[PDB]
Amino acid sequence: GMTEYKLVVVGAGDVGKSALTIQLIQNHFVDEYDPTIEDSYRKQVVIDGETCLLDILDTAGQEEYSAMRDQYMRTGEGFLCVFAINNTKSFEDIHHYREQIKRVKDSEDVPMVLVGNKCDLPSRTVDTKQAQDLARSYGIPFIETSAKTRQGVDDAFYTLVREIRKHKE
Numbered sequence: 253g254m255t256e257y258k259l260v261v262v263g264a265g266d267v268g269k270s271a272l273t274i275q276l277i278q279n280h281f282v283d284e285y286d287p288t289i290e291d292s293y294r295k296q297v298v299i300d301g302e303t304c305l306l307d308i309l310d311t312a313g314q315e316e317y318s319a320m321r322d323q324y325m326r327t328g329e330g331f332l333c334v335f336a337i338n339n340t341k342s343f344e345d346i347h348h349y350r351e352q353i354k355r356v357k358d359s360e361d362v363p364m365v366l367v368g369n370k371c372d373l374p375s376r377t378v379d380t381k382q383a384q385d386l387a388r389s390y391g392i393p394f395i396e397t398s399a400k401t402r403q404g405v406d407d408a409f410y411t412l413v414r415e416i417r418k419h420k421e
């Protein structure tokens with residue numbers, strides 16, 4: 253019946269990984285959540301007629317041992333690769349996340365969704381086209397989000413579950 257899926261939220265610091273996660277889990281926008289805390293959350297949802305239990309890891313970067321990063325990449329079934337639309341470096345970092353996750357999993361086919369967060373902000377430096385083009389080059393969806401207004405948040409997580417299913421199937 254209920255199937256559990258391991259989702260992993262990755263991206264540079266300050267892009268909104270924790271805020272995205274907390275909107276989905278707790279239905280509010282958090283302004284201040286310590287950037288060094290890495291935690292996981294469970295949430296039950298129904299997607300396309302099938303209940304699933306999302307086990308969501310809100311990552312925070314370096315681990316005590318890199319072996320621990322590798323482990324959560326190996327066990328992770330799908331990845332939300334998050335950048336902020338006002339931070340070009342966070343977008344450029346996506347190249348690294350894509351590479352590293354493929355490398356750890358030794359796979360060319362890893363369920364992922366590219367998330368461009370903070371779309372409510374006017375100070376945009378990363379174009380919709382450049383992100384759409386990058387996602388297309390990986391064969392994955394691109395979704396624009398705002399953890400602040402909740403735009404796209406649910407779609408990003410649900411789409412990732414759909415990508416995981418497509419991969420398993």
Ligand SMILES: Nc1nc2c(ncn2[C@@H]2O[C@H](COP(=O)(O)OP(=O)(O)O)[C@@H](O)[C@H]2O)c(=O)[nH]1
Pocket residue numbers: 263264265266267268269270271272282283284285286287369370371372373397398399400401
């Ligand atoms: N305006 C706006 N601020 C955001 C958004 N998402 C996150 N933030 C803020 O950006 C900062 C970093 O968010 P956080 O979730 O801690 O980023 P993390 O380091 O990736 O976990 C926080 O002050 C958040 O309130 C968003 O969509 N819009």
Ligand SMILES: [Mg+2]
Pocket residue numbers: 269270271285286287288289310311312
């Ligand atoms: Mg965080």
